[PDB]
Amino acid sequence: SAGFDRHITIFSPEGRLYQVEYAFKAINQGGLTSVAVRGKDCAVIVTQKKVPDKLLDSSTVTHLFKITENIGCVMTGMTADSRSQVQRARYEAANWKYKYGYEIPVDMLCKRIADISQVYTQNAEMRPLGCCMILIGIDEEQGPQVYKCDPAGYYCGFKATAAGVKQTESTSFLEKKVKKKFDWTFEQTVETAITCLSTVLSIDFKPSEIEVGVVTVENPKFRILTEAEIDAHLVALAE
Amino acid sequence: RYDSRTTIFSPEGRLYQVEYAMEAIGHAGTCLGILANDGVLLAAERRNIHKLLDEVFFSEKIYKLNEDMACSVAGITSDANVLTNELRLIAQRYLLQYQEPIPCEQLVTALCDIKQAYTQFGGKRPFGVSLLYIGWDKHYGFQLYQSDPSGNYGGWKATCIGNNSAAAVSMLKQDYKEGEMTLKSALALAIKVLNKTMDVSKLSAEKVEIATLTRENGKTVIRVLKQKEVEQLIKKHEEEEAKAEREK
Amino acid sequence: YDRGVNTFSPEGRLFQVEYAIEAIKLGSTAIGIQTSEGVCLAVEKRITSPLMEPSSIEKIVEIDAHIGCAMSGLIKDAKTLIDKARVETQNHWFTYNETMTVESVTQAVSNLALQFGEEDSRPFGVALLFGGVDEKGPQLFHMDPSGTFVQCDARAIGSASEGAQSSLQEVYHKSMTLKEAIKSSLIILKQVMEEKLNATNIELATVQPGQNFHMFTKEELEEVIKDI
Amino acid sequence: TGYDLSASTFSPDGRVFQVEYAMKAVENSSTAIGIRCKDGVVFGVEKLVLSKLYEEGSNKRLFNVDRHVGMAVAGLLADARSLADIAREEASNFRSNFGYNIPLKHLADRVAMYVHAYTLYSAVRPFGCSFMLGSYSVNDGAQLYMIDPSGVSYGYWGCAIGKARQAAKTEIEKLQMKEMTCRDIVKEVAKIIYIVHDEVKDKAFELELSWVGELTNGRHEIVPKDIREEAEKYAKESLK
Amino acid sequence: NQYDNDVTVWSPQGRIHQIEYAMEAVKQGSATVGLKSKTHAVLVALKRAQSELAAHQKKILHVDNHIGISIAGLTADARLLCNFMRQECLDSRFVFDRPLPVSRLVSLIGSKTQIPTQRYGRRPYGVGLLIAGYDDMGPHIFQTCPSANYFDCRAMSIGARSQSARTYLERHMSEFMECNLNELVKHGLRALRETLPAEQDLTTKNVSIGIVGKDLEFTIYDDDDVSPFLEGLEERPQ
Amino acid sequence: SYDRAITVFSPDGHLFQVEYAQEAVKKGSTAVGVRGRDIVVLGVEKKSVAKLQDERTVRKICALDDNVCMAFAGLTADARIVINRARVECQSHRLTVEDPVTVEYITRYIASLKQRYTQSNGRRPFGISALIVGFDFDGTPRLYQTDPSGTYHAWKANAIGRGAKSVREFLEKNYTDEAIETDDLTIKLVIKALLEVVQSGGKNIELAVMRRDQSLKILNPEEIEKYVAEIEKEKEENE
Amino acid sequence: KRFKAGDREVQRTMLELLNQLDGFQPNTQVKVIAATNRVDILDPALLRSGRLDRKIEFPMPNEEARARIMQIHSRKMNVSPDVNYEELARCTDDFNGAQCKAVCVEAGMIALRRGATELTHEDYMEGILEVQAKKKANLQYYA
Amino acid sequence: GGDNEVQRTMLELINQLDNIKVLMATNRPDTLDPALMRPGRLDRKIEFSLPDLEGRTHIFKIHARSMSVERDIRFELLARLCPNSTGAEIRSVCTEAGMFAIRARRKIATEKDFLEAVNKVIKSYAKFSATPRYMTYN
Amino acid sequence: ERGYSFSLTTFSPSGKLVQIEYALAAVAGGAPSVGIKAANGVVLATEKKQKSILYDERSVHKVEPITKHIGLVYSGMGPDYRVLVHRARKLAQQYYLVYQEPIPTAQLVQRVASVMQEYTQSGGVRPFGVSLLICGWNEGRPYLFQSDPSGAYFAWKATAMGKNYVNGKTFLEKRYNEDLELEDAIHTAILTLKESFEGQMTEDNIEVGICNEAGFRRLTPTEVKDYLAAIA
Amino acid sequence: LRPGRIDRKIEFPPPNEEARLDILKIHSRKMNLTRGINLRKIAELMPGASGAEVKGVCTEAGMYALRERRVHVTQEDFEMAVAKVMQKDSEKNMSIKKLWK
C-alpha cells in the first residue's frame, strides 16, 4: 500500500494523502508518549522523560513547554519539529494578544497552529511537522479544555487524550475510565494521568522518569510540578 | 512519449497535450449555432437533468458577455467559469476604454490570445473548453464564432461542439441553407438536429436550451426561451415530423 | 550527468559545455591568421540555395571599426553574443573615450558566455574569432562556449577545425606578411573545403592598423582567388 | 530507496532519511569533546592533520560565536563554517536588538531552528556537521549544548562528537565534572581525548582546546600555550 | 549510484557525491605549485597551450596589490571567483582604507562557495585556488578546494599530476622558511618540473610565476619576465 | 532522451526540441514569396475551405505595418500572437524613432522574440516561420524568412509550408532577371509557383501584392482568377 | 533456488550437500566454509541452523583498505619510494580488491610502455584511469 | 529451463580462466557477468572507440589502397564528413564510391563520387538534420 | 491515463483530469452529510461521530455559518474545510464591505468555487478535497448549492455526499416532495442520515442547521434531541 | 491489417430497429408467443442492444415464465425482461458527472 505517496500534493487513487499519513507514524518515532486528561476543574499532562545517559542536562530534556502564562503544551514527535511548533505557537499567541487585546483561548491557539500545518499539507514547499500538540488551559465560561491537534491539521476537544507509541492503549484505558463517571477532582485527574502512563508502560515510574504539568481554575497558570510533588502524588497513588 | 508537458514538441511537430485538450471536448455538451439572417441562436443540451437538480440559473450553458454578445460553453466547468469571467471583464474593459461595444471578433481574439498563452508557457494546463460566440456589431452584423481550446478560432455559419459533434455538423451541412435562413427556419433546424445528435428522443423541452440574439430597435435583445416557447417549438417540430411519414 | 549545466561527472566534467563545443563542428570552417602587417579572416559561405542573398549570411560581422569577427555554430546564440560585443565596445568608448582592446572585447563576450549556469540556460553553442588591432599591435582572439578566451597567432574554428589547424601549424610562422597570410589561408580553406573555391563560396576580411576601414572584400575576392 | 532522495519525503516507517544520513555523516569526522566545569565549560577537539603541508593551526574546528559563546564543530567543515557564520550573525542581531549578550539557551534554540529549517525543503539539505555550544555567565552559570543536524538541542554535562562518541562517553562518565574546577578539567579533557583515536588508524593528529568560565573572565579564547603543553604531557603519561 | 546527481541529496555512506565529483575538476587543470617563505609568497603555475601556435593560457590571476591567485579547475568558475575577490578587495579598500587581510578573503570565499553546496540551482565552484598574499601578519598560502573547505598551507600544489610536486614540497618543507626570493622561486620551479613528464621540461613559455613580498606587490612574470628566475635553475637529473 | 527539453544539448550539439519546432511549419500550408523590381508578391496555397465557414477569420497574410506584410506557416495559434506583437513593436518603433520600421528591422525583432522563447525552459517556441516581405526600405525591395529557432534570412524568393522542398526546387530553375522584369510577370511567377499545389486546383491560391509606396492589395477572386487564366494561356504554349 | 526440467540433477547434489551439513554435529574437526558472490540467488535452505550459518560479510574496501590492498600487490614490483598510496586510495573509489590489484598491474605495464624501471605516481594514476577503460584527454575548457 | 545449462557452461569457463592467453570481443559489454569482467579473468579492458579524424583518414587510405581512385583524393576532407563514424562505415563509403563510379561507366572513382557515397551511407542514415532545420548552424 | 494521474496540469489521452477525480473520491469517502431545500427553508445535517467517548462533541462544529443567512456542511478533509470556511467568510465580508448588502447565495458559491479552482490549476497545490453544501435565504426563495474541488457549483434541491451517498440519494426522490415545509424537512434530513449512520442517534452525534426566514443557525443539542425523540 | 492479407474488413455494427426486430424473431421462433405481443415494440425498447442482448432478452422473457410454471410469454414478460438484460451502470456521482459542462 505504498501508493503515489512520494509527493504530498498527489492524491492516491482511493483519495488518501499517503505522505500526510506517514507524519503520524513519524510522530511515535521518539519512543515517548504523553497523556492529557481533563478533570472537573483542572487539566493535567504527563509525558515520558527517558534520559538514556548520565551526562545529559536533565533540566533541558523537558518535553513540556510554556507558550503563554495561561496555556501550556506537551510534545510527542520529532524533537526539532516539536520545538519549531512551540516557537510558531508562541508567535501566534503573542500576535493574537497584540491584535485583539486579550489572551488567546486554547482552542483558537492550535486552530491557528493546525491551519499553518494544513497549508504545509497542500503546498509542496514545507515538509509537514511530524509532531502532535496537546494543549491545556483554563478559559473562562468553559473551564479547563484539552486540545490535541495533529500534523494533518485536525483539532478537536478531548475530555482526555494521549499521543505516542502507546497511544491506542492509553486512549483505550481512558475509554474505560471516562464512562464510570466520578468526581474528577484535581488529585483524581493527576491520579488518572499517572495510572494511564503506568498501565500502558507497566513501569513503577521512578520520580525522575516523568514530567507532569498542571493547569487549574483556582490558579490559571501553567505549572510543572517539581520532583517532590510528583513523588507525593505517586505515593498517594500507591495507597 | 511527448505529452508530459504542454510545452513539449513532438518529433512530428504536434503539441500532444493540446490535442489531448482538443479531443476532450467530445466529453463536453452539445451546443450549436444555426445559419440565420436578422438573428442568430445557440442550442445547448443539459446532460444533468436529474429531478433533484433545482434550477436557479436557467442559463447554465448560456452566458451573456456584453450587452450585444452571448456565448455558450463546452468543456471543464471551472475553466468555462474563469474563461467567461475573463470574457466579461475584457468586454467591459473595451467598453470603458473606447465607449463602444466590443466588435465581436476582437473579444474572441482576446480570449484566444489568453488561451494560447496557456499552451506556450509552462506550468499551466491548456484551457480545455471550447465555446461558441454570437453577437452583432456595426462592422459585420450578426456573426457566429467558434472557440477552440488551442486558441484557434474561426468564423462560422453553422457548427457544433461536444458529444456527437461530427453528426451534428454533418446534419447541419445536409440541410445547409445560405441566405434563406430566417429565424423560424433556424430554430426549426436547431430542434431538428438536436432530435438526432442527442441520443434521448422526443427532445424534452426541459432538457433543451435555445438562446437567440436579435436586433430590435437598435437594442440587441438577447433572449433565452422559457419552457413554454421551447414546448411549442418542439410541438411544431413534432407536427412537422408526422407529415414526413406519409411517404410509406 | 549530462542533462544540465549543474551536474558534475564522476571524472569531474560538465557534460553539457562539451556538447555545446561539439556544436561548433556542425558549423563552417573559419580561418584567421594574425601577422605584424595585419589580421586576416577567411570563412566558407556554405550557401544552401542561390536564392538567399549572400549578405544575409552573416559569418563575418563587425564589432567595431577596429576589430572584426568570425562565427561558427548557432546563428541565434552568435547574434545574441554579437549584439553584446557591439554594445559593450560602444559603451566602453562612451565611458572611457578610447577604442577597446580586442582582448577586452573578448573578455566581455566571455563574461556573457560564463552565464549558462552561473546566474543566481544553456552554453552558447558558438565559437568566436576576434581579429583586430590595438595598442599592443595586431591580435587574434578565439573563445569557446565555456567562455575560455585565448589569443592565437593563427586559429581555425568550425568544421574541419582539426584538419585546418594541423595544416595551418605547418605553413604559419611569425615573420609573415598580410598578402602571404591571405594566400596561405585561402589555400588551407580550399584544401579543406567540400566545394570548389570561388568568389561566392567564401568571404574574406582583413584588419590593418593603418586601414581600419574596408572590413570586407567586395568583388575583389575574384582577383585574390584567381592568383591562387 | 525512493523515500531517501529528498528531505521533504517521509519514509513508510515515518522518518526523514536525509536527516539520518546527515547524522551518519557526522560520525565520519574526528572526535571533538566538551565537558562543562563548575564555573565554566571546556572544549577538546581532535584535529587530524591530513598532510604535513598544512600549516600549524589550519582549518581550525574551534570557533568563537560571540564574546562568551564558543563553538566546537565536528563534521564536514564547510557547513561548520557556514553554521558559525549564521550563529555569529544571530548573536550580533540579538546584541543589537536586546542590548545584552545572547543567552546560551536562546542562541542554541535559534541556531537549532536555523539548522532544523534546512531539513524541511527539497531545495536544501540538512547540515553535515554536529557541534557543541558553550558559555559561562555569573547570572546563568555554565551551559553546554549539542545541536545535532536534525535540529534537536538539549544540554549535556559532558559530551563528545565525531567517530568516537561512545568511546569518549564511557571515559567521560567516570569523571565528577560537577565538582572539579576545570583548571584541571582541561587536563582531564586532554587525557580523555588521548584515550580515543587509536594510533594505528588516522595516523597523526593535533589537539586544540578552549575554555569558558571565571578563569578566562567570561570569554572563550584558546587556552594559553604553557598550560596546553603541560596538559598534553600529563595526557601522554597515561600510556599504562 | 542514484544519489550522485544532485548536491542536495546525501549518499547512504554519509558523503555528498557531487562535491567529490567537483573535487575531480581541480585535477583536470594543470599542476600549480605554491610555497611561502618567512619573507615572500610565490606560486608557480604550469601554463598549457591548446595548440602549437596558440598562446599558452594564463594561469595566475591578479586579485589585489597584496593578494593574488593561481587557478586550477574550471575557467568560468575561476573568472567568477577572481571577479568576486576583486570586488571584495575594492570594497574593503574603499570602506576600511586598509589592505584586507588574506585570511578574511579566504573565509569569505569559503562562505560564498558553501552556498552552492547546500542550495539547488547552482553547481559547485569547480576551481582550486592557491591564494597568495601579504598582509600585516606575514606571507600566507591558502588552498580553496571546491568543497568550500580551505586550509592554511605552508606549501601546496594542485592540478594534473600535482602529487609529485606535493611529495617534493613535503620533503623540502623544513627549509622553506629561511629562503630568499631566488631560492624559494627555484624550489617552486623544481616542484613544477617534478610535475612535468620526463620528456617535457620547463621552457619560458609554459611556466608562469607570481610573487608577493614584504616591499613587493603581487607581480606577474610571463614570457621574458619568468627568465630572470628561470636562469640559474639546475637541470633535471637524467 | 535528449529531446524532452529545450535547453539540453544533444551529444552532437543538437537542440532537438528546436528542430522539432521546424516540423510544425512543414505541416502548414504552402506560402511562397518572391521579391520583384517594384511589386513584391507573396502567395499562399491550400486554402482548404470547410464549405461552412467564412474566410475572413481565416486570413494568413497580414500587414504588420502600412508598408510591410508577412505570411506565416505552421500553427495559427502562435501566428496570431506574433502578428500582434510585431504590430505593437512596429508602432512602438515608429513612436520612439520617427522613421518607420524597415523590413530587416521587423524581421530582426521577430527573430529575437522567437529566440527569447527558444532560449529558456518552460516556454515553448513559436512553431512558425514567417515570410517577412515589404517595401518599407524606401527604394530597395527586400523579403525575409524567419525561423521558429530564431534565425532570419534574406532571400530573393522563398517557399515555406507543406511543399517547401518541391516549390523551392522548381522556383530556382525559373527565377531569373527576365522573369522579374515586369510586375505582371512578377505576380505570374507567384502564380506558377503556387500552381504546384497539393491538388493543383487553381482556385485555392491567394496572392497579395505590395508595390513601392503603395498599400497592400489582396487580390480579389476575379483578378486572381484572371491571372490564373492568363498563366494557363501562357502555359498553353506547350501544345 | 528451486524450480520435469533438467535442473533436477544439480538439485540432488544440493540436497545431498544439505544432508551432509546436517548429518554432522559441531565440536568435531570438520569446520566447513563456502564462498559466493551472489547470495541473492542462494536457496535459504542452505542458510539454516545446522547448515552453513555464520554468514561472514565481505564489503567493498574503504579508502584505507584500498590503499593497503594496493600496497600488498605492489611488493613484488620495483615501485618508486615516493608513491602516495593514500592519494591513490582517494583517487580510487567504488573499486574492488581485484581492481585494486589491476591498478598496480596496469601501472607496471604503463611504466614498461614508457620504458622506465621504477613506477612513478603518474604511472599509478594512469593505471587507475586505464583499469576502468577511461582515456585521459586534456580538455581545453578547464585550463 | 535450459538457460542454466549455458549458465553452468559459463561458470565452468570462469573456473578454467580463474602459457595461455584469452581473447574476448563484445559490442555490448554491459550484459556480461560482473564476475567475468573482474580483473582476475579479464585483467585488461581495451575500448575500441570511434576513430578520430587522423585515424579516419588512415582507415580511408587503407580501404582505398586497392581501389581505382584518381590520385587527387582529399581523404582528409572525406574524414571530416564522417563524424562519429565507425571503421566499418568508412569501408562502406569506399565501396559505395566505386558503386557510384560503376553506375555511370567510369573506370576511375573521382572525388565527386566519394562525396555522393558519403551523402548516402553516412548522412542518409546518421540522423535527420535536414536543410529546413539546419539553417540554424552556419 | 495510468501514468498521468499524478499531475493536475497534464491532460490524459482521453483528456481526463484524474487528480480532480481522485480528490472527488476522497470527497466520497467522508462523513455523510445531507441538505434538502424546503419551501420554508433549507436544512443541512451531518454526522459528527467521534472515534471515542473521549472527544468533546461540542468542540468542533461541522455545520457552520458564514453570514447570518448562510451555512456550510462538508464531507471530506476537515483541515481543508477550515481554510475553505475561512476564505468563504472573508469573501462574504469583502462583498458586504463593498456593496453593503448581504451576499446572495449564488454569488457566494460562485466565488467559493473560484477559490476551489485556484488550487486546481498549477502543480504543487492540492485541490480542496471537500464538497460543500451551502444554503441561503435571500430575495424570498431558498437556495441549496454544492461546490466540489473541481470548482463546479450545482443547484441541488436535495442531496447527500459522504459514505453511502448513493443510498442517501436513493432515499430521496422517494420521500422528498417539493411542497414540503421546514418542520418535516428536519425529519427527512434526520431520516436520510439514518440509513448510513452506524449506531444510535444520540444528540451529540447528529448536528443539524436550519436556514430559515430568520437566518441560518446551528441547532442546539436540546432541539436536535427533541426532533430525534420525535422521529424515533 | 494490410491488404493482400485482409482484403475485406467487414464491420459488425449494433443492429438497428428493423434488424433487432429480426433478431427477436429468429430467437423466438421456438418460443410459444401469445397473441398481441408486438415484437417490434420490444425491439423499440432496446436502443443499441448488441445482438446477443436480444437473445438474452428472449431467454429472460422465457425465464420469467419458467419461475411461474407456464409455456407462454406475454408482452409484460418481455418488457420486464428488457430492463433486466438491458441494464445500465450510471456514474452514480454528480460531482464526476458535472466535471464537464
Residue numbers in the entry:
A (entry chain G): 6 to 244
B (entry chain I): 4 to 251
C (entry chain K): 8 to 127, 134 to 241
D (entry chain M): 5 to 244
E (entry chain L): 4 to 241
F (entry chain J): 2 to 240
G (entry chain F): 294 to 296, 300 to 439
H (entry chain A): 290 to 307, 314 to 433
Which text from the study accompanies this structure?
We refer to these PSs based on the highest substrate-engaged Rpt subunit in the staircase as PSRpt1, PSRpt5, PSRpt4, PSRpt3, PSRpt6 and PSRpt2, represented by ~19,300, ~112,200, ~29,500, ~32,200, ~24,200 and ~73,100 particles, respectively. In PSRpt1, five subunits, Rpt1, Rpt2, Rpt6, Rpt3 and Rpt4, engage the substate and Rpt5 is the seam subunit, albeit at the top of the spiral staircase, ATP bound and ready to engage. This state, thus, immediately precedes PSRpt5. There are four subunits, Rpt5, Rpt1, Rpt2 and Rpt6, bound to ATP, while Rpt3 and Rpt4 are ADP bound. The resolutions in locally refined maps, focusing on the AAA+ motor, were for nonseam subunits generally high enough to reliably determine the identities of the bound nucleotides and distinguish between ADP and ATP.
The 26S proteasome unfolds and degrades hundreds of proteins to maintain proteostasis, regulate cellular processes and generate peptides with second messenger functions. The redox-active thioredoxin (TRX)-like protein TXNL1 is expressed in many cell types and was proposed as a nearly stoichiometric component of the human 26S proteasome. It uses its C-terminal PITH (proteasome-interacting TRX) domain for binding, while potentially reducing disulfide bonds with its N-terminal TRX domain but how it binds and is regulated remained unclear.
